[PDB]
Amino acid sequence: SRKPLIAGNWKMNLNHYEAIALVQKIAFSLPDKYYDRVDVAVIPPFTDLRSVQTLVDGDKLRLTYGAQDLSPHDSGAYTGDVSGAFLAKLGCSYVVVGHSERRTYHNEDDALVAAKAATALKHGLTPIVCIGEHLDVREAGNHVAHNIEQLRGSLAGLLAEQIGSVVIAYEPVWAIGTGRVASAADAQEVCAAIRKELASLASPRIADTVRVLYGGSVNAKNVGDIVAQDDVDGGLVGGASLDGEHFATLAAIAAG
Amino acid sequence: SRKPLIAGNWKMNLNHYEAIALVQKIAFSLPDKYYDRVDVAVIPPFTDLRSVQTLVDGDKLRLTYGAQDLSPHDSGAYTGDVSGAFLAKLGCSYVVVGHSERRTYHNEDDALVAAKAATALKHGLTPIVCIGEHLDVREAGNHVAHNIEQLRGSLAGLLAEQIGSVVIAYEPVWAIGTGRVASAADAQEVCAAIRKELASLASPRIADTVRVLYGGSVNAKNVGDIVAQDDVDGGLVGGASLDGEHFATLAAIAAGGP
């Protein structure tokens, strides 16, 4: 069995003392008993990471955290870019790679996503590799094949044991920030296809350990149906992750 | 006149522990008397900013600091991107916009740089607006005009008074990794032309207040000649900024003359 994961992508929101207040809202809204049954992570902007690290470590919180991007390179002359080495030193558990907003606004293709995933693993981070098709692909009925091709491209170059160290997030683009959640059956169809492909790229044993998350308009009324699906292992939550009580509620539901 | 500015671009180097060590080494190494004659800033990775803030504020340091980029937007659904609002709350004084590495690796055009400069000013940050021509342009001898057009494009949308609140940095990209060397006279030629353009885009009075930095190779052996030039007001320093003693020496030279 796979332990569920609820990860909050804050996107470009919250300064460093707003970050501390949000983490404290989560940590005091969520009963300790739930952490044995669900992993819970916050994913703040880079500039909030020191503040969140020192709170989480200093108060021995059971919440974990991660970052929203990293460079494919370890160091050097890349003004503006953040290294996985810096994230690892700050105690990050996760890093998001290939979020649709980066693919779209920042010219990130599958090959760059794959390079970022490999660099994340080099630094002991768990990359959350995001894939998801556009509305027209969905309308053409070609969603499964498109996602499989994007998965293959975004994991290119990773060996089987490296695949075993990633998380996948299925982000239908039509569902991101739009209030249009995938039906639980829609989510299950793609996530089951993802795991089947992972079994080819790695092995059946390894694929059965990989957590595959849903993202796209997750809230308290839909999260239960979605995470109950056989091949869905949690959520990469956008807007709802900015409210500590709402986010804690999502985690409690996913814990079951 | 214009007070010299030595700004250290750390680029993608140094974790938060190394950041603290470096700031403390700079503070230890640079005698206090120098700050009256040169402004000194460090420009760390995003993830080091809080650490640097707490040292600068807690030790009452006279050095200032900034970031290496920012989003054109204030907030929202821009996974991975950093807001000028966050930088301001961290006490940043500066933010670099349009660095040649972002123009090359991240496709940043003059119009995007101009939008980033405007957003920096909206959040009370001083943008360091970077421009600079590549080898083919330098070889053609058209380099001054190319720089002036890039400057005009990278400041588009800013009013004359706003141009008084920016810093410009000239990067001789043609001399960065090509085997070519840019002289202090080469820096002066472009920086003088930059100031003349700022006078047209703003006014002569405003242009005379704007700090124009040299952003090519800056080290202890060449910094004095560079800052000695009439229209060069300091440096946006690369690798030497990672060594606290060397960086302190650069600042001391820029302060003390000739």
Side-chain angles (χ1 to χ4, degrees):
Chain A
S1 215
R2 299 168 293 272
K3 185 174 184 183
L5 172 60
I6 289 286
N9 179 13
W10 299 3
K11 310 189 178 184
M12 193 173 71
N13 296 283
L14 307 189
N15 67 40
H16 64 283
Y17 56 85
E18 293 172 323
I20 295 167
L22 177 54
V23 172
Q24 289 180 314
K25 185 81 69 65
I26 299 164
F28 283 74
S29 297
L30 185 65
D32 170 70
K33 69 185 178 175
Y34 291 105
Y35 296 105
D36 285 339
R37 297 200 319 277
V38 65
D39 291 321
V40 185
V42 298
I43 310 174
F46 290 128
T47 45
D48 291 343
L49 291 172
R50 172 61 175 174
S51 297
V52 171
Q53 170 265 319
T54 54
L55 173 66
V56 164
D57 290 345
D59 289 356
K60 299 177 168 75
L61 302 185
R62 294 184 67 182
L63 291 168
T64 57
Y65 54 90
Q68 292 176 21
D69 185 38
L70 81 168
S71 178
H73 313 293
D74 299 328
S75 66
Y78 301 99
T79 293
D81 297 337
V82 172
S83 174
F86 305 163
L87 305 179
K89 206 75 182 186
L90 276 161
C92 290
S93 293
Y94 298 97
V95 61
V96 182
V97 303
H99 194 279
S100 60
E101 289 154 12
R102 303 213 61 80
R103 291 181 183 263
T104 303
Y105 299 134
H106 299 292
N107 312 119
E108 303 197 357
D109 68 9
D110 289 347
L112 180 57
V113 175
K116 287 178 176 207
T119 296
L121 294 170
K122 180 174 181 179
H123 291 105
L125 305 169
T126 302
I128 299 171
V129 182
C130 301
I131 65 174
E133 87 281 9
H134 289 121
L135 176 72
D136 57 336
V137 177
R138 172 59 61 155
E139 284 168 359
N142 293 324
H143 46 285
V144 174
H146 196 271
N147 283 295
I148 295 321
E149 282 150 14
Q150 194 173 33
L151 181 73
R152 285 171 178 163
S154 299
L155 301 180
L158 302 181
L159 306 176
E161 71 278 0
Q162 290 181 298
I163 300 286
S165 301
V166 312
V167 169
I168 308 302
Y170 173 49
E171 249 200 288
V173 306
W174 84 68
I176 301 163
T178 53
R180 188 164 188 257
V181 75
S183 79
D186 288 337
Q188 167 61 23
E189 179 191 34
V190 170
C191 293
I194 289 167
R195 196 179 307 284
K196 180 184 166 90
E197 183 58 29
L198 294 175
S200 180
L201 296 175
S203 72
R205 177 173 280 102
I206 291 169
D208 282 342
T209 73
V210 176
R211 294 196 277 194
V212 180
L213 314 180
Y214 175 74
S217 303
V218 174
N219 60 54
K221 286 181 265 208
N222 65 33
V223 67
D225 276 339
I226 288 160
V227 182
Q229 301 304 304
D230 290 355
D231 287 284
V232 179
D233 306 304
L236 184 57
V237 180
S241 75
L242 302 175
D243 181 302
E245 181 177 41
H246 296 171
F247 186 70
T249 295
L250 301 181
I253 296 165
Chain B
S1 303
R2 296 170 293 270
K3 183 175 188 180
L5 169 62
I6 291 291
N9 181 11
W10 296 7
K11 313 193 178 184
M12 193 171 74
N13 296 279
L14 309 189
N15 67 42
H16 68 291
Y17 301 114
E18 295 170 319
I20 293 292
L22 176 53
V23 171
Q24 288 169 300
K25 183 78 156 182
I26 294 162
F28 181 83
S29 300
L30 184 60
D32 176 66
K33 58 172 175 157
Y34 288 113
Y35 296 104
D36 291 322
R37 281 175 290 149
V38 63
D39 291 320
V40 187
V42 299
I43 320 287
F46 290 131
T47 44
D48 290 338
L49 294 173
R50 178 60 174 171
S51 292
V52 168
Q53 178 183 30
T54 299
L55 222 51
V56 167
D57 292 348
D59 277 329
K60 295 188 172 187
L61 301 179
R62 290 180 73 185
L63 64 80
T64 54
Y65 55 92
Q68 293 172 22
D69 185 33
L70 83 172
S71 175
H73 306 294
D74 298 333
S75 70
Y78 302 98
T79 294
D81 295 338
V82 173
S83 173
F86 305 163
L87 304 180
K89 291 280 172 183
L90 288 157
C92 291
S93 294
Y94 295 99
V95 58
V96 177
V97 300
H99 195 275
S100 61
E101 291 155 10
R102 300 209 66 81
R103 294 179 183 265
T104 308
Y105 301 129
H106 301 293
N107 249 312
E108 298 195 355
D109 68 11
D110 298 344
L112 181 59
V113 176
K116 288 181 178 206
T119 297
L121 293 170
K122 184 190 187 170
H123 295 287
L125 309 167
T126 302
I128 299 169
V129 180
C130 300
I131 65 175
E133 90 284 11
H134 290 233
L135 187 62
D136 187 82
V137 173
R138 169 59 59 149
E139 286 174 346
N142 287 138
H143 50 283
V144 172
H146 192 280
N147 282 301
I148 291 316
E149 173 47 34
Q150 190 174 33
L151 180 69
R152 225 225 76 269
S154 302
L155 297 180
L158 298 185
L159 290 165
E161 212 51 63
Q162 292 178 295
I163 289 166
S165 293
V166 311
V167 167
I168 310 302
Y170 173 52
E171 301 181 78
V173 179
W174 62 274
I176 293 162
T178 59
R180 294 291 298 272
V181 169
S183 69
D186 289 330
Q188 174 56 25
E189 178 188 34
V190 174
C191 292
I194 285 168
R195 199 174 305 283
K196 178 190 279 178
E197 184 53 34
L198 295 172
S200 177
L201 294 168
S203 73
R205 182 195 60 254
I206 291 164
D208 280 348
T209 73
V210 174
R211 294 201 278 193
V212 183
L213 313 180
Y214 177 71
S217 178
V218 177
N219 53 53
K221 285 196 191 186
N222 72 11
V223 66
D225 295 334
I226 288 160
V227 303
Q229 305 303 310
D230 285 354
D231 289 280
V232 182
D233 302 309
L236 183 64
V237 180
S241 74
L242 301 180
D243 181 309
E245 283 176 23
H246 295 173
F247 188 64
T249 293
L250 299 185
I253 295 166

